[model samples]
Target: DAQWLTAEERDQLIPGLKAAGWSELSERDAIYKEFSFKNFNQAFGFMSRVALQAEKMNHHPEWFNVYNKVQITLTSHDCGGLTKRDVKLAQFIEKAAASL
Candidate 1:
C-alpha cells in the first residue's frame, strides 16, 4: 500500500505544486507550505476542511496551527517519500485553502 512516486511522476506533479506555494523540503522527502488567514477563525476553518478530507483519504498531514497560521508538511510515511496519495492530498489542500 505504500507506493512511492517515481521520478517521472514527481516531475509531472511538482511544477503546479510549487506554483501553489508548496516547497520541497531540503532535509527530507517531503513538501511543506504555510497558510495564513485573515484571523484565527479563517485559519481554523481552513484546517477543519483539510482535517475532514484527510480523514476521508486516511492520509493525515504533519501540521501545526497557531493563531492565524497553519504550516503543513506532507510525506507518505509508509512509502518513505512522496506518492500519488500525497499529490492528491496536496491538490485537495490547495483547493481547501482557496475556498476559504
Candidate 2:
C-alpha cells in the first residue's frame, strides 16, 4: 500500500538518508538533493539510469537538470507525503550517483 511513512519509519530512515546527502525539505514533506557530474553527458546518463529504475518501480522523481547538475526531489504523490517508496528511490539514486 502506498501510505505516508510513520514517525518510526521516518526516524529510522532519516539518518541514512542524510548520510546519503538527502535532506528533508523544511517547507514540505519531501527530500531534496543535488548531484553534480563531470559533464552534461554524464549527467544525462545518470538521469537515464534513474528513469529506467523509476519506471521499473513505477515511481518517478521530481528532477531538474542543467549542464552537469541534477537536483532531485522525492515525494509520494499518491500518499501525499514521504513514504517507503521515496526512501527506496533515494537509495537507488545514491547508488546511481556513486556509480558515476
> Would you estimate the TM-scores of all the predictions?
0.95, 0.95
In candidate 1, which residue pairs clash? Answer: none
Off by over 4 Å in 1: none
RMSD (Cα, Å) of model 1:
1.3
| Highest TM-score model number | 2
Which residue ranges in model 2 land beyond 4 Å of their true spot?
Answer: none
lDDT of 2 by residue, 21-82 (tens): 88999988999999999999999999999999999999999999999999999998886799
Cα lDDT tens digits for candidate 1, 13-55: 9999999999999998999999999999999989999999999
Q: How well does candidate 1 score on lDDT at residue 63?
A: 97
For each candidate, what is the lDDT?
Answer: 0.91, 0.92
